[model samples]
Target chain A: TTLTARPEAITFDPQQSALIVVNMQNAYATPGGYLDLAGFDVSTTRPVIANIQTAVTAARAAGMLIIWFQNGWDEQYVEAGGPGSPNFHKSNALKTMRKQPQLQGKLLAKGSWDYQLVDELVPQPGDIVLPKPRYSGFFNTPLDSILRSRGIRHLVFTGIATNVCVESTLRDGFFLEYFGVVLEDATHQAGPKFAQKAALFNIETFFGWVSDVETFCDALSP
Target chain B: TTLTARPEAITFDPQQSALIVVNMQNAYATPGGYLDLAGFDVSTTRPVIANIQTAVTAARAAGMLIIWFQNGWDEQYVEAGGPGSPNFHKSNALKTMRKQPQLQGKLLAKGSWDYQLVDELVPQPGDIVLPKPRYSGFFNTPLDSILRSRGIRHLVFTGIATNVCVESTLRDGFFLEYFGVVLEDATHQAGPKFAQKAALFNIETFFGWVSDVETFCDALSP
Candidate 1:
């Protein structure tokens, strides 16, 4: 009797669920954006973006909370943990560093247009928008408090970098006692395809279900 | 500038470090263990166990705190989480369920021999032994407090289920402001090989460093 919401027999109480859209900011999801200029095929996220849009529409209509989560740092990158901190590693900032001067700034740095959510998934009037300092939204953010206050016991995850930010948040959400569902097609990764496959495999095999936009949207009506 | 300790340049202050050995209990690592009989090659953990032993000996000699982390539940699995909990998911308990009668009971049941640490890695005197009800050792456990009290700010992680328990704890430790190092060869996963690779990738890319036993042992001399 493991707590599960099989894709075939999925059911949920909209009131107890929240849709977490992670790191869909310009830096990761847009053309001519940070990862794009860094040589990653940001266009790979096109399908995922469209899927997320559909999921968001269905989620909103179903009366579930939609939380827009982004990762950002102050002008000085203070939130970017100092030396000896994981966030301080060079690979994390290398690409962004390469394009800094021409872009007139860094990726995910606060107050940058690049840090804003992509226009396609802008937060609507009722949506919750917040920036996380780390990969997992629950790390130092008020996400947990917001979820508990709204009685969110189940989470539907949709966003970019499936294996990194998306997987990190989903895994942490599971650890925090929230049942999770990863909308497989609604999430894209900038890394190798195998990394993306592994993330989905983990969710379905243990963390939660590897659902798609259609399946998740269908289940939301109930 | 990322906080990295590559194999060639591994460095750490032993005073600020601790070795977290996760889920190395007989239920998962020993022959005929739950995972072993479930068609998983628990034998995959053989080299891991030996690597952990070597790492542990050096860690102890280095004057670092050694914490033995295991997972278990009361006879009725009261701590396994209720129906809506991740712990309640079948895939999590399916292996144990299949071999139940001959195994005599579920894996990690309280008071069962299977719940104890594998004989090769039993806790020595002065070592901390604690059971985590969830994957991450810091969740609902006194692990964080213990680390802080001892002024331990760095972690060297090793153990079973690389993609699940070990990765979960390492990720959380990263969020909690601890520098982390994963002894890749000292950890084994029953999941697909890719899941194991992704976990290591995540650590090396975002959470911490991915090191090996020899490199780690060599760095322990202060």
Candidate 2:
């Protein structure tokens, strides 16, 4: 007898906004990642790379559309060694995991070197990279037809392990009604510090604007 | 009207038992972490370091007992980024975020190197680190009084983001009964793929014995 919320605050228009940036690349910046074995530091990737590059330079100076997802896998690692693979290979234990052979290819596979992106970031030239095979870049990829052919409608997630793929693409982008935010400390994790503190306390109590990363990178560098 | 099964399947009780491993640190093997971004690859940490050194060489030839855990952050930059932080330093559009000069004082903060663990799968010397703040290391830490003061009773989890703290300590260790197993490719994730596909479809339906880091490291090697 209690399901309330007829409307206490919810509101959004933002001219069909967007700013994604999932995965960040190079296999989550290496070293036992999941956001460097959880408990993130370096003051949490310098405000998550200066607030997601100041919100990708304020959503590309407001023209909006700064996507960039990533999951890539086709060199046939079959998504890296079994079950939800955290790299959980097991071919006669250790000795460099026999047949699993470092996930065969590399990075997102295809070429490897982990995958690349760090070293002071990159991916300009309009930057978009979608890819995703299984970590919800909106699932079947092409990112919801490139966000409904650029009409967008609101999203803003920024990268790295924020409670797993930015709270699993903001819990399916709030069931795809869009209007999500979730950029807290820009994101990081290895796993289960209370499931990243109960997924940043359920995205700041029922999802939305989990801020920090220098106030959303100064609201994406004003 | 569906919850049966009592005292079934007991056999594997080789002396109380113990072999935890959660977190496996060095901020998840260094670099940028959380799985080394760029769509986060990590080849899944070479089969989770060959399935936890072959399940600690079969829980030390069956004698068993090897905890680990670890999470960190007693203090490095606090005031209340707790309960699961990621609020991105409390927005305000992110004022250069606490001056992220390489995230001042880190390594998983409160300690460092993102909280140590990876000496290439280190943890010898009668292992057992056990420290956490959240994500079900059996919540509020001390890890079930260090597994009921070493009486243990069959736990067997592995480490890293296999859907947040290994499915939040294997769903509170199968609702605190133990005999739980997470293994399934020895856990992993940078985050989201639906929290490792809904924590391996709720640990293959109702927690424990998920197994697979190569048959749970060849039934703990040795």
Candidate 3:
């Protein structure tokens, strides 16, 4: 089977393909969530919520392994990689919370709404929901092991903020020899439209393929 | 103890600083090399040659560890990460070579002129030259160990293709608890002007700090 990806179509077997659902958590997609509360235009991520739902369903229907990513830290922020770890100094959420003490233990904190997945894209039974400490899903996570155990090779990405987490994970995956395909319309970029454009351009030219959910659905059809 | 960098001025000890020269190689920097051979407008990378030289000399004067990064594959292309590796499929030089058979073994092959460092920025004694098979200098390399052993914590990056190898190493370095700074005028992006802007923007806002060689030289002085 072939999926119409950017640069060219990519041939794949459903048994070996996966739908990588990256960081569809409330903190990123919903109003008053982490990104929203941090002053980012979370509205850009709204449409992708429904798009990811469709992508997840298609993956399940095609029997492709579906991995949902939950990226955040804990209550004490111990998982922020420590003071010596770069995320402690660079992560936006961590920085925001450090300045706004009133919002401690809320933004991306474990058990908080910000860390939970949005209602539209809850993890169903048999689906793999992986919690990532960093932006890249493959960072110290079992994502690679899970995919390797299932003999998964091809990857279709859908998520929030194409320029950050989505791109980070996709770049790492592609470097590891996974066939990467980004669902362009199924994900949103963090900053302005320029950020989104730069990310997609990077993917199409330097990383892997770029496609849309509609095209993915077409390719997934019998 | 402080460098006037973007977003904010970063306080850094010269005793704990290193000038990371990323991919300042013949293949990526000079004419008739890998990137130029592939019609990537190598002219965009020209000015950084002079800037990097000045930056390197300043680093040496300040007794900073000068780490030179040579990123490419070997003659057998084994370092391209095997057939299953992403660079085998996504590397622009590899792709260009695959399409033009006459250029085989001439682009980024170890020992070839294409694989050597540019003459203007050649590694001198007391500097460490590290060969890497990937974009990020930290990946599977002794970069972190070297820095840790030397107690180096702050990084100043200068190189070709600001949006690729330079940015890649900077991001990875920042994540590992090392403060990151990019010599803006000492690095060049691969694509159009926007690619350059996006990279600096990303660095100033997300990864670490952005500064120029002039500013870096000033910081290196007493």
Candidate 4:
């Protein structure tokens, strides 16, 4: 009996994880360079803000980390202009041709209102701020070191372009040994067709559990 | 009148268009280079060949126009010697390397047996072939005028490297105002993780309807 005894399966506690807010800048949270005039709805951003604020506040109350991420390129957008760059140009070009303020120059410049976080959300003073050159926060950045320093074994990511940067970072986080959760409602996307497909399919399967920020907040709060 | 009642929704029909097989060549299709390990399974070719056979048979029978696409660069291994070339060589002071058969090769070249259609699948005499020099099949190719002359609308595609050439061609196809249907299983990719994700999500949601070969066959038949 003693020789056949087996050890109990170890379970990881989720309280040590961080809530990652990725690329939630004015670039998307406001109108100008981005907005579907055909289907303009202010209600979309309102509910999204409420959910993320709830999650961040709850996570902060629980003594968990809230990591803020922003996507920024060089003044010339050089890092992504190389052959390997993922410099995709689509909807913005149409608006820029019409002289939109947000599309006038690089948004994430060191000092620019366009790059600033929208009034709906702002990073806490003690929280971490990571500026990423590409879509994924961890690519050639200090993201991994920062996460490791904080002992963040899990991540809950919320941001714009669900099928692009959000999905990109989620896969990288999963592969890098972090249990990742993508906040479905906290993420805004180019369109519902592909955005919802990503959350409903691949994100649910291999990467992590995806749920709206409100439910996630309630469940994780004390 | 029908105008007073508003026109009916436009129909989604594949038979009204031409089918473009992009870069179904030996150099990129076979075992080495360009997603070498991804195409390891001999069975991978089965789905592709089967789908092509089905599409070709149906299109030919229905008198639908079809175009076959291939890509070949003029430089040899040495001439194209950089890290980005995909044929990087350290020892070659000269710009040519005969060691790799896929390098500096033409359509259906030597050693890259898999680049050619497997024994079971063959291109009959009636099909048209277009060889390209760069990314998109229509970059410098004759695809535009050909489609224009033939009065084709819908574009169904199947081939190697699902994310690379297939995606490139589909992009150009859309720009040319052609409806592109990139069959999922018809192409196998040896691309980066982002590449695979981009192909599966972006292409289907934005560019065209992406279906697996089985579903494609079923849709065409039914």
Candidate 5:
């Protein structure tokens, strides 16, 4: 099958393809979540949920494997890095939680509401849920080996914060030899509209192809 | 000492800091080279060489370690990846060289004119010259290990094409826990002015500090 995407079309086998949902946790996508608690406009990302919902459904029904990457550190933010690491210094969640004494354990803790996938796109029984400590899903995770072992080659990416986690993961995957595709409307950038355009600019020109859900579905069934 | 930079000054120990100069190769910077051959205006990048030269001199005088990254794949394009890889599909150099048969082995090959560093800011003795097969210098190379072994924790960046190879390597370095600094005037972006702003936007807000050669010099003994 071929995905009608930018730069060029991407062809792949159904049995060898995977759909990666990046950081759709309540922490990033919901009101009263980490991003919201940090004063960012959470409403900016809420509209992408439905687009991601349909994209997941189509990919699942097409028999392609689904991988869920949930971004969070432990209760102490150990994996998030200490002051010695730049990740800790620049992280929104860490900074927000640190300032509010009550939010320490509740912010991005694995079992907390903040870390769970938003209601619309929870992982199914067959889906793989991988917890990542950093922005890139491939970092310090067996994501690459898991996809490689399953004979996976093509990757279709969706979820929140396109400019940060989604774009980061896609770039890493591209360098590792995977053909990457982005469902443009299925993901949102953390900053302004300009930021979203910037992330898409990188993906469309340098990293991979950017396609909308309409064409992604068409590629699966065509 | 700290660089008087954006997002705040970066305090560093000169003994444990390194200056990273990314992809100043003729392929990306000089006129009549690969990027110019691919129809990008090489003039956009030519102006940064002098800035890089000054930054290098001050960094070297400060006693911080110096690392120069040169990007290229072999003549057979083995490291550039074949058809299955997105690097092959999206790479400008590969596409440019492929379209013109006479350009083969003369573009981005290690021994070719396009692969060497531009005349003004060539690598000198006592500096580490690392060759990268991909966008990120740390990939398939010893950059991270080299820094770790040397007890380096902070990095100052300069070079051409800030949006692609420069940003890629900086993001990777940030994730690996290095404090990153970009001498803004020391680099240029690949596309239009928006692209350059977008690259700086990420570095200033998310990754690390953004400064210029003037403040970078002030941070050092120079």
Candidate 6:
């Protein structure tokens, strides 16, 4: 007998499920955006965009709530608690490196093109758009309350920086008594391949399950 | 000028900080432990035991709460919610393979040697010992409440399976709004070296800081 069985299919109640697309903003995913201009390969995220589009469409057809989780800070950086800490300093430095004038300016500041959702995965009119100040969507935000009101207990995660924001939000959702599943192929990482593997490893070993967009779409579609 | 300043020193109020030593039980750390008999090298963890011992002692002296996060299930595994899930089945299969009679028992079952803390890092009289059901200390455990009631807002993590349990608990602590720090030299992993490096990388980039046992001890003493 096999000691561990791989999940044969992804299955969950649509009424209790939600699809959370995390930090897929232009700053991190698009060409000529902040991290892209800073010389980190944004191409790493390119392959996953099509998968995310497929997953989002299937989730919508299944009637699950779609939440666009974007990481943003104010122009003045007040919500970021000022520049007293290392994290703030790092964010400020990144903001100062934006090169494209059309997209040039602060990274994650509300009015900049860098803060907007990538055109490939733009939110539909009925979808929810949430701006977060930090990595985890639930931190200092009404994400938890919104999910609770809508009776969402299972969250399917997608988007950029799999090891950072995507993994952070998924871990918190699990802690808050929500069942989490990461759409592995629908999420992208800016770091090395080992980093992406590590994130998926942790999710499968501890926090939740990992499946690809094809598995998720098949489960959601009629 | 430095591109990024190595924090002048790691500092936090002991009254509001905690040292969380996770899953340092015989099952994963001792010579005759379960993982040891299963042909996985538990030796990776041996070097960290001395560091963990030093960190725990200094933390206790500084008046910080020292939490021994142990994983345990009832003899029948009733606390584990039975062997219905893949995780349970996987755990049980591993336990079945332990060759040593003394170590040949249910892994992490209450009253078994496997569930007890290794002799070197046994709890002192005033220290808190938490029995966790899952990889994370905060999962279905009173750890969060205990920390909250004691006014703990900063958490320092050290333990076995650096990529899994130690990293998982530390990530959750950060999500719960606690400032987190990982004692890098004081934690070990049963997996690949890349997994360990990935954990440290994620903590530094997204969640919190990472320091060695020497830096932590120096900060705590006097």
lDDT of 2 by residue, B1-70 (tens): 1111111122355346677787777565445542342234455576676777777777766677788877
Query: Could you give the candidate ranking by lDDT, starting with the highest?
Result: 5, 3, 1, 6, 4, 2
Native-to-model Cα distance after best TM-score fit, residue A130 in candidate 3, in Å: 1.2
Candidate order by DockQ, highest to lowest? Answer: 5, 3, 1, 6, 4, 2
Q: Between candidates 3 and 5, which one is better according to TM-score?
A: 5
Candidate 6 wrong stretches, greater than 4 Å: A1-10, A37-39, A82-105, A148-151, B1-9, B14-16, B31-40, B82-105, B148-151
Instruction: Judge candidate 3 at residue B83 and give its lDDT.
Output: 63
Best by DockQ: 5
Query: Model 2: what TM-score?
Result: 0.32
**Winner by lDDT:** 5
Candidate 1 residue runs with Cα over 4 Å from true position: A1-8, A37-39, A98-105, B1-10, B98-105
Cα error, residue A208 of model 2, in Å, equals: 8.1
> Which of 3 and 6 is ahead in DockQ?
3
Error of 1 at B222 (Å): 5.7
Indicate whether candidate 3 or candidate 5 has the larger DockQ: 5
* Candidate 4 chain B lowest-lDDT run of ten: B1-10
Distance from true location, Cα of B215 in model 6, Å: 2.7
- Alpha-carbon runs more than 4 Å astray in model 5: none
How do the residues A2-61 of candidate 6 rate in per-residue lDDT, one tens digit apiece?
A: 111133333468867899998888888888776676556787677788888888898898
The TM-score of chain B in candidate 6 is 0.88
Model 2 CAPRI rating: incorrect
Give the Cα-based TM-score of candidate 3 against the true structure.
Answer: 0.95
Which residue pairs come into collision in candidate 3? A162-A188, B162-B188
- Pull out the clashing pairs in model 1: A2-B88, A2-B89, A2-B90, A3-B88, A3-B89, A88-B1, A88-B2, A89-B2, A90-B2
- Candidate with better DockQ, 1 vs 2: 1
Cα lDDT for residue A173, candidate 4: 66
Native contacts retained by model 3, as a fraction? 0.46
**Interface RMSD for candidate 4 relative to the native interface:** 12.7
